[PDB]
Amino acid sequence: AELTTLARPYAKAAFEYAQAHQQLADWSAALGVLAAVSQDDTVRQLLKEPQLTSSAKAQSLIDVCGDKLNAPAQNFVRTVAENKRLELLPTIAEMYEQLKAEQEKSVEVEVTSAFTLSKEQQDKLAKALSARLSREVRLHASEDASLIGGVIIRAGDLVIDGSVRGKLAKLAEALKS
């Protein structure tokens, strides 16, 4: 199955508890540190040994994180380990942020341009995107010399291409016919 199909129940349970107790910020840090720690090459190896029991894998991961996990977050790691799903931690953190972003009415937007775009232009783009998405947009600008001009915006599955590269492809498709 897709890792997203298996991490949905755990991400939803952690989000409902964090929301009901007003701990939304705390759990973003706990899940983020568990995700990062579970992917380091010595922890990645310890979480695959055949002689360790589920409780020892959970305890080892709890001791490494230490103070970056409250009592509820420790009960959650013990639950994920007992159900044999510690490989889902990076995906659980990713899905928890999606639920939190839609709760706070915010959207993460990726932007690529031919040349560096100034703060005035970034805010001008953000204003329009916020109006159509009816969400607080957070832009992540980046450079791509492949484009000969313009910008390409992407927010989830929505893709708006204003780059002259895309315009040159449309011109080609209309003349090759």
Add this chain to the structure above:
Amino acid sequence: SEISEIIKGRIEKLDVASQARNEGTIVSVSDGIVRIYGLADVMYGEMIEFPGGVYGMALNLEQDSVGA
């Protein structure tokens, strides 16, 4: 990143046991088939040595284990 020096310092104290590429551990036993963890260097059709002078042959080299 999220890996603080404290977190990095704690990870170095873990009792992570190193496995040689020529060694493995029996995970399950059933109907004449033995599944083994490790054996990173074993070749398809190679002979495997178990305790008490018993021998097996590696036939399934899967991503996480060897079926002998």
Add this chain to the structure above:
Amino acid sequence: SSGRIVQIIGAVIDVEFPRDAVPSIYEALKVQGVETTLEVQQQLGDGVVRSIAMGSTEGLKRGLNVDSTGAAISVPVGKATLGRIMDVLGNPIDEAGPIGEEERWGIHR
């Protein structure tokens, strides 16, 4: 050391044991407080063994304690067995009382 029943599906029962006390293949196990014996068929890993019951499963529950006997099913042999009726485990099923056995042998050879 003792294990605990974790799953029951038909005649097949799964029992979980401490990782340093897992019973051998064909070893006989006894369920605490119930007159039922189990024979280990496979070692599934993670301290779990799969077994078949040598009695009715109507009285079984998840979480019941299970004891390892240290050997395969052992039955009485020799002259004492003549003129007697026995079950799979070697118990007398006639009303003539206990068998005057002097030796017991494992059924696997």
